[PDB]
Design an enzyme around this catalytic site. Structure first.
Site, PDB file in Angstrom:
ATOM      1  N   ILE A 107       2.737   7.065  -1.459  1.00  0.00           N
ATOM      2  CA  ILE A 107       3.722   7.946  -1.783  1.00  0.00           C
ATOM      3  C   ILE A 107       3.892   8.382  -3.087  1.00  0.00           C
ATOM      4  O   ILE A 107       4.056   9.886  -3.366  1.00  0.00           O
ATOM      5  CB  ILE A 107       5.176   7.402  -1.505  1.00  0.00           C
ATOM      6  N   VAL A 110       0.829  -1.150   0.051  1.00  0.00           N
ATOM      7  CA  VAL A 110      -0.165   0.038  -0.063  1.00  0.00           C
ATOM      8  C   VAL A 110       0.927   1.132   0.026  1.00  0.00           C
ATOM      9  O   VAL A 110       0.739   2.288  -0.631  1.00  0.00           O
ATOM     10  CB  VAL A 110      -1.081  -0.072   1.307  1.00  0.00           C
ATOM     11  N   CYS A 111       1.971   1.073   0.780  1.00  0.00           N
ATOM     12  CA  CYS A 111       2.523   2.489   1.044  1.00  0.00           C
ATOM     13  C   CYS A 111       3.239   3.084  -0.072  1.00  0.00           C
ATOM     14  O   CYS A 111       3.114   4.345  -0.347  1.00  0.00           O
ATOM     15  CB  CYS A 111       3.873   2.214   1.967  1.00  0.00           C
ATOM     16  N   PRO A 112       3.877   2.282  -1.150  1.00  0.00           N
ATOM     17  CA  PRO A 112       4.337   2.936  -2.527  1.00  0.00           C
ATOM     18  C   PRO A 112       3.355   3.629  -3.079  1.00  0.00           C
ATOM     19  O   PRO A 112       3.583   4.748  -3.745  1.00  0.00           O
ATOM     20  CB  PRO A 112       4.915   1.930  -3.264  1.00  0.00           C
TER      21      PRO A 112
END
Lengths: 195, 195, 195, 195, 195, 195
Positions: A52, A47-49
């Site tokens: 970002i 999820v994080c990328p």
């Protein structure tokens, strides 16, 4: 100093990757600007990328409204840079228009109330800090659900709208949609118009 | 029991206005259902009715995904009902498809960490509680900016999607958009597809 | 239990990267075997990869003497895997024949006395632990100077030699070089020979 | 003051044999010099003389790089001299090019964390101390295995290299072998060179 | 300071509705004047409006004797205004000639000893406070029984009478009914007359 | 037990004059009856006899509604009888239809919160106590102003009305005047009726 709405944002300092190079950032550096400070668990995850890259693509629209965007995790700045030098096709970030802050001590995550002590990583916490360092909004998601970049931008503009117009922003408000003069008499204009 | 993501939601009990009549509600009553619990400062104000009516109009879409919606303020249930019997044109609520909970003691607001003690009213706090009473998301706005009902619905569906599919939801995810299998190998499918 | 020679190695557990996949590793898993447990500051740095790739390249020779090699740092298991998937000529690790353990909480480093609390990273500490979990040797370098893999292996073989021959190993001992029978009369064999 | 890497070496004072004469030595005497301070258990034993003679034979190579070598045990200075006046053929030292320090009170070993209190003798601890009295390296072996004089010299020269060149020393680094500029872009020169 | 007859009325400050607008009111504002301060449980209830509208309808007669009337409850000032803008035949207040004070924090009720802590609302307490802020009379009813406005006014006139005539007021005294000179010989005027 | 509305009336016991005879009375004796317990400062004063004779003259109307009336002061029962045997013309009571209780220890006045400790006499406190010994109403006047017997009787009948009809009594309610059903829809019957 506390991570709650209406309070001054806790002071932070660490090394960030800005424009491919290592640079120190602190809360002081954002005096005079709106700051979106958001926490994600770990570099090289899932999820994080997506969050970002979505913030970085939209970054220009934040800068146009005097708002900086800073991503924070417990990873090192070296890891941050390696993740920037990984292409998006392969789960990387690519070129970044936002800072990536390293919270290597975990103290920033601790101070903003988002560290899961047992795991040693931050939840998906997000803070909209105003030019005086006051928190206007906060949000936290559990790890498997990404946030809305569009909603964050909407909120930054709404707070700026109330600050410069002295009217309040209805639910679902977007720029150029109707606002409310916050007294009983003058509010009537808005309620009549939309009903 | 604490108002933070991953923890069990603090227990609450009070009198609500449901379908024009006074009825007791507690956290127990929502076991087996998703609950959106949201706090607003005061009845008969400006941003607050716009949020309440927007949630009530969208209520059917929450119920279709097994999600209840409950608005909470420090006002009495009698005040809540008078506000329901005020037309939307005149700053009222009209007919309601959601419960309006009275936190007359202010203890619910206190227990969810949203009471401004000095003023005696709650900030714009919102909590998405799952069927096991666990908080999956929280958000807080300062008083002059209303929340997004659409974003709340998006989040309720995303959490339900991960619970029943075992894939995670990217930033800005909407239903039928791509999701990620959360292992390094299987994630590659998603990243290749969108880049 | 403490990180000192003659004492039992402190217990550790964490998630590692073993052969490109995530696997739980603890000190119990090395019962019956020798263990070289070495700490390094950070993934995607400078001395660190050279130590890790030298130990990996030499891992077959430790394995043939019933010795496992585990590298440890405060980086996440996902970061370790990313560094494995980075080629050696871009400062990566390539294929690894050793486990890469993730001390994300920092508690393993703290327990082994090698954590710089102020920075949130480990010094270059190395520990040779015997099949009963006892520390036979320990070394620490400051950050800019890499260790000798060659010397680590020599020390493992030397401890093994004394355990199965009852003779002690002189300074600069290599396999098949003369050893000492550790009593006064019997030691003269050694001293007469080398002088 | 602690016997840890990065910290100032504990103060010590005691009587040493130097050129067959008794002479007081303190940590202050090595200010402006590198110091290899190494502990061994007991005079007239077995591994110990092999380490002490190997260090004395190579002492010119340490002096040529501004490094003194001082061997330390809990024995008396009179016992040290007895050992010096015993030929190597009989498990003695012979003529010495290094100081033999007496830690007759056992306090030096105690302050440096290498004393076995129950036995009254020191483990095979080695400390490399820089001109400012800071510890750059420490190692400890259990009693039956001697250390490497070669590796100690490698480490002294490695620490000198980084101090006067600003480049970090890889695993297995020997003089004239390649080093790394410790920033991300510039480090590529090294990794491309050796792959 | 305490809520007891003969004692100085506790200090209060809050936001009130005065003539359809929001205005700050404190006990200082009534210095030089008599004050009927009465508490009622909740806006939009049953006995409450009847007490408020009866005092409002009679307010001119208190004003002509230098007496202000202030109604107090725990409801917000916005709720008070909404109740003012509700017609009398729908259980509202209509036009108000008295101030409606908002004790949103509940501290005024707490300080005047009329708050039911468990429910978060005030009992039907009434206080007659003289121009020097001293309590001359107090009464409390349980919730289902309204007070007498007629009796409140009679008591205000009686206290005023004794202050400017030096005679005391008998049971059931109305203006121009006989009074007593409060010494033994002079009191016989009164007792001989009415018997 | 406290002298507060909704609470159980404090226990009392003392000697009273009843039909010109001395007789013990306690709070237990009024179990199953309504009780008007009213305190006055001193026998052979001025306001006091007017209140006591007005209550005695109307006592039949209280007895007809299952309500006793008991006057209380700090004077002795012998003093009470003296006062009873003094004609009204001379500031006495004459024949009495109510009990005159002696609170000679001052404890009854002290427990009911109406004792002025510095003067040793009670303020004009009145308590209406129901058959279960719960306080429904309390009032206190400063010394120079007598209470209303009429209003006391109105309040006793009002409390009896709500207990046997389940409707709440408006401001200025008299027997046979309109009452309110205490739920929102049903209360409209009252507000439409009187407007």
């Amino acid at each position: 100093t506390a991570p709650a709405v209406t309070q001054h944002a806790p002071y932070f300092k660490g090394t960030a990757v800005v424009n491919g190079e290592f640079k120190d950032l602190s809360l002081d550096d954002f005096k005079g600007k709106y700051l979106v400070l958001f926490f994600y668990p770990l570099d090289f995850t899932f999820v994080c990328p997506t969050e970002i890259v979505a913030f970085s693509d939209k970054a220009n629209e934040f800068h146009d409204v005097n708002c900086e965007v800073v991503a924070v995790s417990v990873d090192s700045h070296f890891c941050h840079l390696a993740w920037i030098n990984t292409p998006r096709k392969n789960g990387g970030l690519g070129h970044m228009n936002i800072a990536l802050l390293s919270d290597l001590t975990k103290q920033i995550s601790r101070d903003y109330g988002v560290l899961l002590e047992g795991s040693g990583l931050a939840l998906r916490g997000l803070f909209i800090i105003d030019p005086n360092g006051v928190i206007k909004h906060l949000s936290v998601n559990d790890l498997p659900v990404g946030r809305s970049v569009e909603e964050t931008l909407r909120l930054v503009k709404a707070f700026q709208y109330v600050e410069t117009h002295g009217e309040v922003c209805p639910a679902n408000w977007t720029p150029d949609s109707p606002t409310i003069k916050p007294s009983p008499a003058a509010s009537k204009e808005y309620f009549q118009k939309v009903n």
